Amino acid sequence: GLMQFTLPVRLCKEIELFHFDIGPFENMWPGIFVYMVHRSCGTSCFELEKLCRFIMSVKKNYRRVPYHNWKHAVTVAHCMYAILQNNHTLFTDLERKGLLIACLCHDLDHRGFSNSYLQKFDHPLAALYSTSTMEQHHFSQTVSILQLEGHNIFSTLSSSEYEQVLEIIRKAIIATDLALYFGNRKQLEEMYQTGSLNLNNQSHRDRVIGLMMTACDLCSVTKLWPVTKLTANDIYAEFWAEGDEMKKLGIQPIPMMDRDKKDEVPQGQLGFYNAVAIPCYTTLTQILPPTEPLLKACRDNLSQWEKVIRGEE
Ligand SMILES: Cc1oc(-c2ccccc2)nc1CCn1cccc(C(=O)Nc2cncnc2)c1=O
Ligand SMILES: [Mg+2]
Ligand SMILES: [Zn+2]
């Protein structure tokens, strides 16, 4: 009860900022997560013994892939932490609990391959789940780990609170399917401009939580340039591996995934920032004004990719 987590001074200060990098010391990421749950939720939200056992089972069920790994899980949870802390009064006790857990679990047991690749490979998961294939798998794994003896971090919730929190986590994890983001943001855009956005409308919260999830999922574009640039290598290492696997099925991959087209990466980053990242953080800033630093950092990195193209690096 009276046991807090405390971080070194630089981390204690920097962890509050959106652009925080969790660092290369794997062994400190669990403490970083608990620290965030305690300041975001309360020291009382979860039994520390059960939380710590949940965290380590979740870590174990992330795989050794270049990008969709344990470090991504914690990076995405930290961004959600910064959004929740800069928007104190907007979210329920249940939402704060559910969303940090949703983020930590959002890519559980990822193999480093897109939903497309599962479908063309004809992976069993593609037969079991026709849309948002990996994302329904991630939710499935989350519920599995929650049902291990000693791992029910929600045991103190009522039968109906427990159902609301698992339903927040499910919608939250499904929303990380980037195919669903485009229409989700178009609707949020229309609702905000025509003035119909209403945060007491549950179907409207759902949409806003989904955009937060896209924003946290993409947050590597909102870091300082050297973090963003080096994460971009991790992300292309998966894409090109998937491209290789497409070629093995007798299919020319999209250029994004073709390692023979490394040269077109700077232009692909531009497309991505203009088509996905910038629009995402724009609409998010409109709905949640204190998340503007994400939009600003994103624009800064777009400007850095433009410099790469002009041969200024
Ligand atoms: C459509 C297209 O075509 C090309 C292309 C084309 C020809 C030759 C080389 C690349 N790239 C893209 C977009 C690539 N893409 C798609 C999805 C997600 C990300 C992403 O989360 N990026 C990211 C970067 N740094 C930190 N965190 C995250 C991403 O970059
Ligand atoms: Mg994912
Ligand atoms: Zn992710």
Curated annotation (Swiss-Prot):
Location within or outside the cell: Cytoplasm, Cytosol
What biological function has been recorded for the protein in this entry?
Plays a role in signal transduction by regulating the intracellular concentration of cyclic nucleotides. Can hydrolyze both cAMP and cGMP, but has higher affinity for cAMP and is more efficient with cAMP as substrate. May play a critical role in regulating cAMP and cGMP levels in the striatum, a region of the brain that contributes to the control of movement and cognition.
Pathological association: Dyskinesia, limb and orofacial, infantile-onset: An autosomal recessive, early-onset hyperkinetic movement disorder characterized by axial hypotonia, dyskinesia of the limbs and trunk, orofacial dyskinesia, drooling, and dysarthria. The severity of the hyperkinesis is variable. Striatal degeneration, autosomal dominant 2: An autosomal dominant disorder characterized by striatal degeneration and dysfunction of basal ganglia, resulting in hyperkinesis.
> What is the annotated tissue distribution of the protein whose record heads this document?
Abundant in the putamen and caudate nucleus regions of brain and testis, moderately expressed in the thyroid gland, pituitary gland, thalamus and cerebellum.
| Annotated binding of a divalent metal cation 2, by residue | D107
Q: Which residues of the full protein are shown?
A: 724 to 1036 of 1055
How the protein is affected by changing D107N?
A: Reduces activity 1000-fold
Provide the domain comment: The tandem GAF domains bind cAMP, and regulate enzyme activity. The binding of cAMP stimulates enzyme activity. Composed of a C-terminal catalytic domain containing two divalent metal sites and an N-terminal regulatory domain which contains one cyclic nucleotide-binding region.
Q: What is the protein name given in its UniProt record?
A: cAMP and cAMP-inhibited cGMP 3',5'-cyclic phosphodiesterase 10A
Return the similarity comment: Belongs to the cyclic nucleotide phosphodiesterase family.
Q: Which residues form the active site?
A: H68 (proton donor)
Residues that hold 3',5'-cyclic GMP according to the record: H68, Q269
- From which organism does this entry originate? Homo sapiens (Human)
Task: List ligand-binding residues for 3',5'-cyclic AMP.
Answer: H68, Q269
Binding positions for a divalent metal cation 1? H72, H106, D107, D217
Which top-rank group of organisms is this from? Answer: Eukaryota
> Quaternary form?
Homodimer.
PDEase domain ranges (all copies)? 1-312
